[PDB]
Symmetry: C2
Subunit: 846 residues, 2 copies
């Protein structure tokens, strides 16, 4: 009958793509009919949908660009007045009447193309491409700082300041819109570390990192975290896999970036289940160690009587600045002082902050490799984002291994054996060894021992026999120190009486960071307990590198003093000097059990010989490849190697984030995850294997006497498949509004991917809360610090959604996708579920 | 008779150099006797002094290096066992008794040298040089971040993180020491901007910049600032110079970096003398505009009913980002939205934050020059500090002038005329013009006009005749806007009825930033008050540059619409487009006097046509040369040119900081000052001239109808000559303790230069406080925000000292100079002035 058939077949979701009642220019809809000429109109079936952009545009300008793009991409018909020449002079200043005329004729030429191919598929590509040319309909309008003037890439590989926060919006003003289903009374952001009570922001630790940031201030979320944690502490049991395949504790990821209440609550759950507060015997069996690069966390943990191990990142920087650099190395004395533990004369217990320390972790390998890529692509701003490429990393790796075998290294660490020698002999710490320093981490899992394997395992194994007792570190000259442990039960170097175990243990580590250091003879006080004793050299420096096979027998005088002679070397392994001496009669195990030290009734963790006896092993690398068979699954190899890890004195196996990875994430490593409860199936493996294989790995490790921790990731999820209309504001990592190249936006409706969770969340979300409330009522009557209320188990989270999220890093969708009428009213589809406004549609559809 | 004569001739200041009782390894003392051979000793005269470093050292290792350094610099005698081979094997592990034996023989050899020549002059240089090799006795021990791993230089030219703060130290522990004369109960640092009350650090604005930071939280200092301000407000009268040579108000330097009590009290003073609060007629005659690069100051000043003008630094960034960049210019639209004032349809009065705005100031020119220097010397960390050289700056200037003349500019601003076109036509601001944009600022003052003189002054003069009424800005395309003023007394574009002054004023500025923009015709709404009216093009673009002599007569239709045709151009002056139209029958002055607009009884400054009638002129460049004659003094030239400034419509003459410069400061410009009250004498000229010459410049400017502001500089002084023993901690510019390459220090005695002030401070410090206290008692009963205490005029500051200071930027002296005994007790000289400890000297002394 007429062109009114452009109107939607119905004014509801059955005919009009929408998201919570809002329309998107990228949406499609089913009109009543279509037409290849103005004269004949065919009604649409239920399978005939058309892009909204054929009918509506955000401005007359975009409408002109729509015409101009399609005409120049094959949709011209001089009979209808459409050709490159006929449309080149159209602009926003053309009368509205004419432009619509032209637009109405273009649809005809489109339907012509649709009919010839019997398909909208080519048209779909042309719409998608064209959208890419319009900033407000594509990602550019999100104002990534990557495109800002003078932006430099960050070798972390992510973009701290590309964020939007989810804000409440219950407006009755249709120009502002209404997303009340996504409203929240919580979203208390930056309640991080000492700002848990919002009254001390001295750590300045940001809430937003990457992905969908989880609102860990919401009591229903806080309840779900406990459900999740409880699931993982019983993983094998609750999954009917190996009944001994359960995690014992947690590596807490991004503990500087979540509401700190959830640290209290994870440590409360483990105390409720296992009785850890005031009982180091039990607490040492359920380690919780927090990832952090903020020194203030050590204040907080000491304040809370140490519910979690603090990460001694200051010492990592010390290690790299003093020993790792090529030149301009820092004062050798800083190794004595620049850590959470001053180790000049560490001759006490229960005084240091319980802490874990490292030479490398998976993030520090990431930063260095990314740096290599950045160096090979100067002036390319998107090299770590939209212009990131795997092949660049492959090339940086070939550079990394080649640089690693050099003496004058360009990118890799100098003095890595000395670094580990100090780590594995320091008192008052739980040291952590990195998988990628033992194995070449891009090859299949544990298939290539690195150049540093022999030296580190030599030190790891020696720690079991020699590292106990007091500690003393002495600066010998400007580039040379000794660090001495006195042996089991020996408090200090003036102790004369000891038992057999102490007598035959203790250790001297000698470290220099001047490759030109003059030959010279030094005196090492080993302690009165070690007078007239035979020592051998566990590990020494030779021109080509390192030896563990010096057959000399060294002797202490009647004062426990050992004289050795040391000089500077320069080789792939040592830039300076490295030398380690242990008692000749030694070898017996000297680890301390919790029942041999005095329990501290007012601490969870307490820094002493028992806790010191522990060794954490980071079991993965982000650059670990995908396996090509069942036998290359990390879980399976880990099961078969449980005894090797125990031989090395590892007691605490930090296992990779096991969760189902978003399949387009950069490393497939598990932090970018779609499902917190699905740790792999036969049909859908993770990089590491299947959940059943995980439960066997954990069981094998327990059988070798080790405890296992899971990377608990409360900060964010990535890869949700469902969109919600959310009101957002462009912010920085700290959730403060951000202006980019003079532009910003606030309180705008955004079609973010926010709803999902997988079958894992559907079937296990909230499943144990009733059981937890029965067994542990305290978890749901203890008021959280930041909120003043207890975790709320009366709601189960079976599917995530924006009401449970603080915001998201930019998703590359664009900010002007929501359709707005000429007067600025949002278009809207009213029905039973969506009652924010009356139905309000563009004229062409209405 | 023997080595006991090494002891000091007396255990007091008469024979031992010291600072407040503390001894320095760099000091000298008079021993009782000296000897060349260990056998004969000659007693010393009053003139026979020896360096302490010949007798005492901070460690055995430095004693070793002292021996080794002097033997290898010509103090060798094999008869005395001193030769290069005889000393190379010494080390801190040599027995102390032997090293002291060796050191005693070295003195004999030193004394041999001292007798051969008849002088300790060569020994002085050897000592001085030697100290340069010991980190703990020289500047490296200060932990300058310039030397840190990975340091990059800052084109500001200073080092924000090289600071120490002065802390209280009244200890009876001789290992901690005692500097209680330097104690204070104030030193409330970072009470800056919105953190005046200590409860809102959201601006995060640091206390420490450079030099000796003045503790503007101290009530005695606050009272002295009032004394100073009152002196400057009466400069010519109180100096018996020209009786009309007095400043009228202030540009306030580093307003973001001083306790904000001090902004209140300068506004209070102006109000007490001149009755400015609630009276814009008086207030506009006594402008106080605040230097600021922090947006948070706009809120503070709005909260305080605008006692000072806010500095619209946001808009300056917008100007450089949208128009001045070579490429990737920001959205033209930002010129409408990105300033303290949104100018889409600015059709109101008394709403906007009273503000001053600029295209350039002397600090932005400096950052750019330094950046040229840094580009010219990549990878050199000290290039802006110890490695700074004027010759590099000379080279940068040859580059600046050459690049300025290019079309493809590498360093200088694109579209500078259009920037000033927008600045000088914007409503709701007091615009500020930069001296260095009208003149080639490295030449003698005003001797050389720049390439931009004709254009800026054309717009400047035009403002007198055309710029008034409401404002509308309209984005025409992605790279092109019009900004329009409707003329005197015309509120908006819909007003139809107006007097003759309105009919013949108003102005259209058309600004494009796309040099390849297509030729196109545009419509400009001039307002219903401007229908059927002839227009002339005041300033336009031509292929080679700018015209202001287009003879074309343009006409508006019956709605006030002006149709012009514009395109993109590319030449040294325009990258994009610039075009300016005004009514043909215009020319009459249209500035507004305070009495024509409604006074705001609850504001000091209010943003309306009278405030908008003012124009600030920054009179100086840091790179101004030294004059070579009397005729070349900036003051003398300013007096001869007062009519020029008023012809340009300048009403507010921002005068350079007139204080006596520290004679080795970088620009000699007056911010690095030794004397706050001495603005130049005939025998000791500042760069700009003599105080008497300044008074005649001010009077000439007044004679031309201008008001004159002095750059008021309360943040810091530099160049004190008196040292004090002060207890310091290494900090960043926010007074937070800092670690550098893993090192820090805290509560350490430092021999800082902190005492001075000049005769100006002696003869005028506190001089008017009795007068002020009787005239304006409120100044000394109003309690300051930060301290809850009124300024205290019962102590006069006639000499500055560390008790009146927050701290200092690193003075490049060293931190381990104070002499420490083996047990860590500080050495000390007890006399009638210094009673912190018993006298306690090294054993040799
Ligand atoms: Ca977070
Ligand atoms: Ca992390
Ligand atoms: Ca229990
Ligand atoms: Ca994949
Ligand atoms: Ca991104
Ligand atoms: Ca360095
Ligand atoms: Ca600064
Ligand atoms: Ca200050
Ligand atoms: Ca300044
Ligand atoms: Ca010149
Ligand atoms: Ca010139």
């Amino acid at each position: 009958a007429g062109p009114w058939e452009n109107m939607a077949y119905s004014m509801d979701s059955n005919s009009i793509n929408n998201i919570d009642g809002y329309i998107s220019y990228t949406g499609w809809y089913r009109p009543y009919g279509t037409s290849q000429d103005g004269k004949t109109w065919y009604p649409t079936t239920v399978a005939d949908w058309r892009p909204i952009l054929m009918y509506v545009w955000p401005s007359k300008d975009v409408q002109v660009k729509f015409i101009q793009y399609f005409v120049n991409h094959g949709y011209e018909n001089s009979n209808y007045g459409l050709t490159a020449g006929s449309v080149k002079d159209l602009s926003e200043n053309t009368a509205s009447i004419k432009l619509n005329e032209v637009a109405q004729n273009l649809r005809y030429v489109i339907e012509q193309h649709v009919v010839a191919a019997k398909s909208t598929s080519q048209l779909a590509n042309d719409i998608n491409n064209f959208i890419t040319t319009i900033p407000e309909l594509s990602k550019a309008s999100e104002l990534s700082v990557v495109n800002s003037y003078g932006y430099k890439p960050d070798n972390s590989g992510s973009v701290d300041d590309d964020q939007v926060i989810f804000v409440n919006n219950d407006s009755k003003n249709q120009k502002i819109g209404n997303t009340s289903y996504a409203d929240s009374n919580y979203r208390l952001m930056n309640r991080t570390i000492n700002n848990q009570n919002g009254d001390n922001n001295s750590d300045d630790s940001p809430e937003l990192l990457v992905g969908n940031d989880i609102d860990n201030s919401n009591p229903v979320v806080q309840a779900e975290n406990l459900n999740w944690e409880y699931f993982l502490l019983n993983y094998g049991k609750f999954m009917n896999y190996n009944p001994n395949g359960n995690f014992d504790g947690f590596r807490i990821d991004a503990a500087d970036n979540i509401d700190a209440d959830v640290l209290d609550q994870a440590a409360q759950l483990i105390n409720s289940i296992y009785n850890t507060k005031g009982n180091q015997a039990n607490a040492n069996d359920h380690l919780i160690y927090n990832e952090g690069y903020h020194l203030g966390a050590a204040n907080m943990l000491d304040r809370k009587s140490n519910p979690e191990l603090y990460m001694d990142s200051g010492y990592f920087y010390t290690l790299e600045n003093v020993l790792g650099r090529a030149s301009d190395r820092d004062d050798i004395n800083n190794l004595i002082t620049n850590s959470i533990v001053n180790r000049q004369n560490d001759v006490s217990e229960n005084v240091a902050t319980p802490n874990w320390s490292f030479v490398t972790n998976h993030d520090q390998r990431k930063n260095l490799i990314n740096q290599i890529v950045i160096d090979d692509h100067p002036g390319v701003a998107d090299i770590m984002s939209d212009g990131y490429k795997a092949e660049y990393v492959n090339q940086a790796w070939k550079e990394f291994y080649a640089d690693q075998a050099r003496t004058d290294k360009k990118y890799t660490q100098y003095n890595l054996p000395a670094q580990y020698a100090l780590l594995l002999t320091n008192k008052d710490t739980v040291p952590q060894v990195y998988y990628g320093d033992l194995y070449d981490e891009t090859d299949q899992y544990m298939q290539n021992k690195s150049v540093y394997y022999d030296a580190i395992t030599t030190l790891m194994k020696a720690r079991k026999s020699y590292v106990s007792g007091g500690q003393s570190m002495i600066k010998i000259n400007d580039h040379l120190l000794t660090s001495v442990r006195y042996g089991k039960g020996i408090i200090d170097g003036n102790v004369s009486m000891t038992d057999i175990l102490g007598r035959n243990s203790g250790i001297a580590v000698v470290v220099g960071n001047d490759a030109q250091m003059a030959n010279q003879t030094i005196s090492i006080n080993m302690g009165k307990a070690h007078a007239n004793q035979a020592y051998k050299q566990l590990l020494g420096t030779i021109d080509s590198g390192l030896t563990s096979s010096d057959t000399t027998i060294y002797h202490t005088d009647s004062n426990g003093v050992l004289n050795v002679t040391v000089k500077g070397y320069s080789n792939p392994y040592v830039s300076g000097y490295l030398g380690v001496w242990v008692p000749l009669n030694g070898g017996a195990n000297i680890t301390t059990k919790a029942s041999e030290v005095t329990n501290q009734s007012d601490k969870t963790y307490s820094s002493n010989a028992a806790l010191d006896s522990h060794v954490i092993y980071e079991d993965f690398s982000l650059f670990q490849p995908e396996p090509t068979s069942k036998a290359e699954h990390a879980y399976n190899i880990i099961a078969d190697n449980a005894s090797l890890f125990n031989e090395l004195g590892i007691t605490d196996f930090w296992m990779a984030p096991a969760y189902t990875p978003f399949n387009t994430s950069r490393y497939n490593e598990g932090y970018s995850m779609t499902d917190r409860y699905n740790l792999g199936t036969e049909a859908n493996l993770t990089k590491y294997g299947s959940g059943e294989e995980l439960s066997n790995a954990i069981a094998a490790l327990h059988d070798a006497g080790l405890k296992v921790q899971e990377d608990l990731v409360m900060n964010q999820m990535i890869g949700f498949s469902g969109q919600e209309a959310v009101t957002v504001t462009r912010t920085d990592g700290h959730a403060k509004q951000l202006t980019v190249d003079g532009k910003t936006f606030a309180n705008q409706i955004y079609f973010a991917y926010t709803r999902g969770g997988g079958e894992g969340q559907k079937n296990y979300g909230g499943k144990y809360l009733d059981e937890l409330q029965k067994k542990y009522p305290e978890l749901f009557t203890t008021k959280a610090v930041s909120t003043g209320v207890a975790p709320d188990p009366s709601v189960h989270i079976t599917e995530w959604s924006a009401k449970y999220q603080n915001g998201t890093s930019l998703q590359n969708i664009g900010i002007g996708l929501a359709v707005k009428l000429a007067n600025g009213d949002y278009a809207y589809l009213n029905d039973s579920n969506n009652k924010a406004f009356n139905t309000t549609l563009p004229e062409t559809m209405s």
